[PDB]
Design a protein around this ligand. Sequence first.
Ligand code: FAD
Ligand code: FAD
Ligand code: M49
Ligand code: M49
Ligand code: ZN
Ligand code: ZN
Lengths: 230, 230
Amino acid sequence: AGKKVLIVYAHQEPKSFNGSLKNVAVDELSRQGCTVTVSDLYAMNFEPRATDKDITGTLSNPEVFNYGVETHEAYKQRSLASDITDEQKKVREADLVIFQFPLYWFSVPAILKGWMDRVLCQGFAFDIPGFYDSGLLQGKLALLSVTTGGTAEMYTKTGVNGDSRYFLWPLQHGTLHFCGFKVLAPQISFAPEIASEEERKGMVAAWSQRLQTIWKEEPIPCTAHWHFGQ
Amino acid sequence: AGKKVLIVYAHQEPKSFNGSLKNVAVDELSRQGCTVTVSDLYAMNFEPRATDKDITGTLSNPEVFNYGVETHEAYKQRSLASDITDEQKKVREADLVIFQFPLYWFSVPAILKGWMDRVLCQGFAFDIPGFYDSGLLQGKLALLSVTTGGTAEMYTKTGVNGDSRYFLWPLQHGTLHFCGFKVLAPQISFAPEIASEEERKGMVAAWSQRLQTIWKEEPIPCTAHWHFGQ
Ligand SMILES: Cc1cc2nc3c(=O)[nH]c(=O)nc-3n(C[C@H](O)[C@H](O)[C@H](O)COP(=O)(O)OP(=O)(O)OC[C@H]3O[C@@H](n4cnc5c(N)ncnc54)[C@H](O)[C@@H]3O)c2cc1C
Ligand SMILES: Cc1cc2nc3c(=O)[nH]c(=O)nc-3n(C[C@H](O)[C@H](O)[C@H](O)COP(=O)(O)OP(=O)(O)OC[C@H]3O[C@@H](n4cnc5c(N)ncnc54)[C@H](O)[C@@H]3O)c2cc1C
Ligand SMILES: CC(=O)NCC[C@H]1C(=O)Nc2ccc(NC(C)=O)cc21
Ligand SMILES: CC(=O)NCC[C@H]1C(=O)Nc2ccc(NC(C)=O)cc21
Ligand SMILES: [Zn+2]
Ligand SMILES: [Zn+2]
């Protein structure tokens, strides 16, 4: 309290392990008195593709379509599609954005990649200047809560997949940091499908317990050193 | 020589710099007598979202939808949606797959992320076990041709963005190598928007020039060391 949290959630199945994580997050943040909002991407049939439909009215160059320029102009002229502006409003109000998603190809599922591509437009999320430490969403926290098919050992530096931190870089540094977010340590729930039962409960309660003190956390140093170095 | 190439292409605007890199690739590979096919994702309105619409028969578990399990099973039963199977046939016949795209958040645009998510399914592109060097697309080549907003200098170890290779890890290693491809060195065309008209033409010609001898190239060692040094 009086903190506001947006959960951007990307899983097709409410009964899934990702669903339980999103649900404990709602329950636990709600119990603490926080304002909570959930963008359930699949239930919304969220549009992932960046297209000239994302701008309403007529385009600032109808002959040669440049998505970055058109959306930056449209943001400034209040002319973006209402699905984008609805999400921007929720992000602008949010003190903390939590992303809840199964890892797809060492990244976010496409439907969430399209939320980042379409919602985080120039002039809203970043500008010249105002990227990295001075990006436009500075003051806000962000947190990736990711579930994997691969095991924790597969995700170490000499394991087949490399360090978990290797795949966080495009998301934590190239996206969240770039926009000005302070990045909280990722929550990574490894390999729920091949875990018991009891290990899954353990992972759910680790998350529930972490959420109890989420407002006391220090952000990570979102650096190349943090992701790759010793 | 008698080789087959698939260009998976992700830009909205035919007149764009990405469109020019795609067309020069078509022209040049066509001139050498290669068989060439282009999946122009935006023109196809390619579906990026992994949903239960991608399976047409009875689900293994209709109570709890698991997209990876159901697609794996649907692949073996030949009950995947036809847009997925159409791309799989293109990949199956290809000797080389070029991905042509602008960098979006240190990654591929969501439309192209959806293509990886949906087309490279278990059974087709890899199995457990049957990945990295045992992946199912072994013996095929892939190449990322990427355009950026940021300059070469912004993409170095000591630049704001970190080395360009850092952002290639989820795509080259986590996705292509994981499916068994050998990965040719990426073509990165930095900052065409700020480049002079002359430097822009040099970058297009450098790509066309490289493609003349693409069949003589050896792939990279797609390892943590290659991406991260250290
Ligand atoms: C296109 C695609 C690409 C992928 N790429 C990668 C990749 O790059 N790297 C990688 O490692 N993995 C990858 N995966 C695998 C994927 O990340 C995992 O399949 C996913 O993270 C599993 O999370 P889930 O929520 O779907 O698990 P679920 O299958 O829903 O959950 C596992 C089990 O937990 C149960 N459960 C639900 N709630 C609870 C509860 N509260 N307490 C205890 N148990 C509960 C479920 O019912 C289920 O039995 C990929 C998968 C796909 C489809
Ligand atoms: C959602 C989003 C996220 C992004 N994220 C990133 C990021 O993470 N990192 C990053 O660095 N950048 C990022 N960008 C910037 C993006 O990668 C660049 O805008 C894109 O790579 C530029 O390529 P283009 O084909 O669209 O260039 P264009 O604007 O189409 O090309 C530049 C100029 O070249 C001209 N041209 C076309 N053909 C030729 C030809 N044959 N010869 C000479 N000139 C020609 C065009 O007419 C144009 O004037 C992002 C952009 C968006 C919209
Ligand atoms: C042991 C086990 O089940 N491992 C999951 C493998 C996992 C991975 O490490 N990379 C990757 C890429 C795509 C998938 N896709 C699936 C599970 O459908 C899964 C993985
Ligand atoms: C000048 C420049 O574009 N710098 C590179 C940084 C890069 C990034 O990480 N995210 C992002 C988002 C948009 C852009 N540019 C545009 C046109 O949107 C560039 C970047
Ligand atoms: Zn950072
Ligand atoms: Zn590799």
